[PDB]
Structures are given as C-alpha cells and as structure tokens.
C-alpha cells in the first residue's frame, strides 16, 4: 500500500510566512490612528477580506472609521512589507529532502504570479521550489477552492490527482485538494497565523493535521516517500 506518487504544496503559511507580516501592517497602521487591536483578531478577520469589508467590520465591531489617508498608507506599507516574507521553519529542509529522494512535487497558490515568485525569492526558496509553480492564471483564474489548480499541478507532473497528497493550512486550499481527488494533510505550524484551525481541517476531511515540517517529513517517510530519520 503506497498511497502517494507526489506532493502538492500550498504556498502561504506552509512554505512562506506572509499572513503574520500582513497582520502586523494592519495592526500598526490602525494603532497609529488610535485603534489598537491584537494580531489574532486581525489575522482572523482582516486577512483575506476586501477592503470595504474591513471598513464595515471596523465600524460594526469597533465603532471606528479610519481617516482619509488609510487606503494610501496601507498600500504604501503592504508593498514595503512584502520584502520581509520569510520561509516557514523547516520548509527548505522538506523541499531539499523531497528533491534528494526524487519525489515529484508542485506548488499551487492563489497568489498573483508576480507575488508568488517574489515571496519564494525573498524567503530564499526559489531554487528549491523548482519550476512546477502554479498560480490561478494557469487555470483561467479558477483558483482555490476550485480543484482546478491542483488538478492542473498533478497533470503537469504526469500524475493522477488521486495519487497526490496536498499540504494545506486553510479550508480554502484544503477543499481545492480534496475536490481534485487528492488526500489532504493539514499543516499548521504554530507561531504563524493560518486561516483556519485544526478542528475545521479535520472536519473538512484532512486525513491528518500536522504541526511541523519535521512531522510532515516523518509522515512522508511512513508513506514510503522519504527515509525514516
Ligand atoms: Na495557505
């Protein structure tokens, strides 16, 4: 029983740390303007929300309406901040191990293509990540949670999606992997925010929920893809 032929990776939260950096920008721009929120609230409610929606939330939940310069300053600073994206601890080692073992893998991200590659670059992962790196523009904009991106990634590796394992930190991305026919392993590295928690990923249908790249490599070894260490 060898369950998998290939690994399909999420980007944000699994290979690179971006949601925490974005949360810090919200927190500082707001704090400067009088409203002091904690990073967990910001990560939970602000990240991956449309700007008008953030304004509605601020008004409804905090009786707060930001000053005119709010949009401009946020943009100026999300831009400057994107350079500060880092690799998730252990991620480079997982990619290096898979490459040494000759296991096919691909990355599937809802990031716009330029940003996807910028993040891999500043995180120091470009060489390790390889060339099977897919954003929604490869599937006509039908990004996660549609299965299309992971179906396509599997196709590009010449492997059936049913024989892939998808490593994801959100319901949005986990759903895309399951809908493609893959097995879902949640990965929630602590110390970094993720869009959903372990209970949600398990209820969604993750076969497991791992909490470190060391645990991921151990699981991949149990599945016959790496050597147990
Ligand atoms: Na993610």
Task: Report in angstroms the alpha-carbon separations of 130 from 20, 162, 174.
Answer: 25, 22, 22
Task: Report in angstroms the alpha-carbon separations of 173 from 67, 130, 150, 177, 191.
Answer: 34, 21, 9, 7, 20
Dist CA 60 CA 161 (whole Å): 43
DSSP assignment letter at 13: T
Q: Is there a contact between 183 and 3 (Cβ–Cβ < 8 Å)?
A: yes
In angstroms, the first-to-last Cα distance of the chain is 21
Ligand 1 center–CA 68 separation, angstroms? 31
Dist CA 217 CA 213 (whole Å): 6
DSSP assignment letter at 197: -
Q: Is there a contact between 184 and 174 (Cβ–Cβ < 8 Å)?
A: yes
The phi and psi torsions of 48 (rounded to 5 degrees) equal 65, 30
Which one, of 164, 152, 158, 143, lies nearest residue 207 by Cα?
Answer: 164
Ligand 1 center–CA 141 separation, angstroms? 17
CA angle 34, 40, 42 (to 5 degrees): 50
Ligand 1 center–CA 110 separation, angstroms? 8
Annotate 119-153 with b (16+ C-beta within 10 A) or e (fewer): bbebbebeebbbebbbbbebbeeebbbbbbbbbbb
Which one, of 214, 193, 195, 204, lies nearest residue 91 by Cα?
Answer: 214
Dist CA 229 CA 226 (whole Å): 9
Query: How was this one solved?
Result: X-ray
Task: Report in angstroms the alpha-carbon separations of 219 from 56, 80, 135, 167, 224.
Answer: 43, 37, 27, 12, 9
103 phi-psi bin (left φ>0, alpha ψ -120 to 50, beta other):
beta
Residues in the chain: 229
Ligand 1 center–CA 139 separation, angstroms? 18
Give DSSP secondary structure letters for 1-58: ----SEEEEESBTTTEE-HHHHHHHHHHHHHHTT----HHHHHHHTTT--HHHHHHHH
Dist CA 41 CA 43 (whole Å): 6
Ligand 1 center–CA 229 separation, angstroms? 27
The tokens of 229 are what? 């260490």
Ligand 1 center–CA 50 separation, angstroms? 17
Dist CA 137 CA 146 (whole Å): 13
CA 164 to chain centre: 17
169 is annotated as contributing to ligand binding: yes
Q: Residue 156, Cβ neighbours under 10 Å: how many?
A: 14
Q: Which domains does the chain have, with CATH numbers?
A: 1-18+85-229 (3.40.50.1000), 19-84 (1.10.150.240)
Ligand 1 center–CA 167 separation, angstroms? 9
Dist CA 89 CA 96 (whole Å): 13
């Amino acid at each position: 029983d060898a369950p998998f032929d290939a690994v399909l990776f999420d980007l944000d939260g699994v290979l690179v740390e971006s949601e925490g950096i974005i949360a810090q920008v919200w927190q500082s721009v707001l704090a400067e303007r009088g409203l002091h929120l904690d990073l967990t609230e910001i990560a939970m409610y602000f990240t991956g929300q449309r700007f008008d929606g953030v304004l509605a939330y601020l008004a409804q939940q905090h009786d707060f309406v930001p000053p005119p310069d709010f949009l401009d300053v946020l943009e100026t600073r999300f831009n400057a901040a994107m350079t500060g994206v880092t690799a998730i601890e252990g991620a480079a080692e997982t990619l290096r191990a898979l490459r040494a073992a000759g296991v096919p893998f691909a990355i599937g991200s809802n990031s716009e293509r330029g940003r996807l590659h910028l993040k891999l670059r500043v995180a120091g992962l470009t060489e390790l990540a390889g060339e099977h790196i897919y954003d929604p523009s490869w599937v006509g904009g039908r990004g996660k949670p549609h299965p299309d991106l992971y179906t396509f990634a599997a196709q590009q590796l010449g492997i059936l999606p049913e024989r892939c394992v998808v490593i994801e930190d959100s319901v949005t991305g986990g759903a895309a992997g399951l809908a493609a026919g893959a097995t879902l392993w949640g990965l929630l590295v602590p110390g970094h925010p993720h869009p959903d928690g372990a209970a949600a990923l398990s209820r969604l249908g993750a076969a497991r929920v791992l909490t470190s790249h060391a645990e991921l490599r151990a699981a991949l070894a149990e599945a016959g893809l790496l050597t147990p260490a």
